Amino acid sequence: NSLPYGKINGTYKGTEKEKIKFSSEGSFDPDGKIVSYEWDFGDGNKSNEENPEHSYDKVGTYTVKLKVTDDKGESSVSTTTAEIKD
Ligand SMILES: [Ca+2]
C-alpha cells in the first residue's frame, strides 16, 4: 500500500473570531482513495470535515495538523501554522 498524501494548504492567517476556511484540496491517494480527514487546530479543537471552517478565540500562532487515512486504513500527517493577530 502507498500511503496517502495530505495537502494542508498552509500557512493560514486571520484575526480573533475570524472563521478561517481550512482546505485539504490536493490531497490524494495514488492507489486508492482518502476516506477520512482529521484536523487538529492546535487550540485543543478537532474536526473530521474535509474542509472545516474554524475560528480562534485568542491571538496566537497555532500548530494545525491534518491526518488523512486511505481505504486500507493507513494514514499520513502534515502540519502548518495559523497566525491569529488582533
Ligand atoms: Ca493507499
Author numbering: 685 to 770
Passage from the reporting paper:
The eight holo s2a molecules are virtually identical (average r.m.s.d. of 0.2 ± 0.1 Å). Here, the molecules spiral along the crystallographic axis. Along this axis, molecule pairs A and G, B and E, C and F, and D and H are related by NCS translation that results in an off-origin peak that is 63.9% of the origin peak in the Patterson map. The holo and apo structures resemble each other (r.m.s.d. = 0.6 ± 0.2 Å). As expected, the most notable difference between the structures occurs near the N-terminus, where Ca2+ reorients the interacting residues Asn685 and Ser686. One calcium-binding site with a pentagonal bipyramidal geometry was identified near the N-terminus in each domain. The pentagonal base is composed of OD1 of Asn685, the main-chain carbonyl of Ser686, OD1 and OD2 of Asp713 and a water molecule, while the axial positions are filled by OD1 of Asp715 and OD2 of Asp754. Unlike s2b or s2, s2a truncates β-strand A through an approximately 126° rotation of the ψ bond of Ile692. In the s2a structures the termini are the most flexible. As mentioned, the B-factor trends in all holo and apo s2a structures are similar despite the difference in crystal packing.
